[PDB]
């Protein structure tokens, strides 16, 4: 089991080697491929905002405080993403790993803190 800091649990079931992992024209590839369908009902916007902020923090090489109830302007964070050289959204031109074919729609990829919940499959 694996979870983010927004409480979005997830069982990891796929081991894709580096060649099979999708990548971007930058060369960045994901460690986890989270389904976008986990968001609209769970409504964990914190994970998305954390990804957007971490994309700019990693480029600037900083660490930012994202505590709850701090003043938050998602529009300004997206403008900051644009000013960091990325797109206004965190989306990037992504290439399918196995076929080498780019996706028609740009894919939102960025850093996100993830935790390994102590529910190991071998234990239970």
């Amino acid at each position: 089991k694996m979870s983010s800091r927004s409480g979005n649990k997830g069982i990891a079931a796929l081991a894709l080697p580096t060649s099979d992992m999708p990548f971007t024209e930058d060369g960045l590839q994901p460690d986890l491929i989270v389904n976008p369908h986990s968001h609209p009902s769970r409504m964990t916007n914190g994970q998305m905002i954390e990804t957007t902020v971490g994309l700019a923090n990693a480029l600037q090489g900083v660490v930012t405080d994202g505590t709850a109830f701090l003043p938050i302007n998602v529009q300004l964070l997206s403008e900051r993403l644009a000013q960091e050289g990325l797109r206004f959204n965190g989306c990037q031109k992504m290439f399918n790993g196995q076929t080498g074919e780019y996706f028609d729609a740009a894919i939102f990829i960025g850093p996100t803190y993830h935790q390994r919940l102590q529910k190991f499959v071998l234990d239970d």
Binding site: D31, G54, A58, L59, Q60, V63
Partner: protein, 69 residues
């Protein structure tokens, strides 16, 4: 415990320059000290580390065990 020998995401050997980087960051914080207001982008790229989100993400954020125990 340490900075990984290679970036977890893509396998770029950040571990080569990790030992230089911790000391460089320590002197950098000493010359200015918010706590993490510093922009280590230029400090990081001075070591040869390219403009990769993953490598810098795992380099500037990994916790050192010697700094805690």
């Amino acid at each position: 415990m340490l900075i990984p020998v290679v970036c977890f995401t893509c396998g770029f050997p950040i571990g080569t320059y990790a030992a230089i980087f911790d000391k460089a960051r320590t002197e950098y914080i000493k010359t200015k000290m918010a706590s993490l207001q510093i922009e280590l982008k230029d400090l990081i790229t001075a070591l040869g580390i390219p403009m990769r989100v993953c490598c810098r993400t795992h380099l500037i954020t990994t916790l050192d065990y010697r700094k805690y125990y």
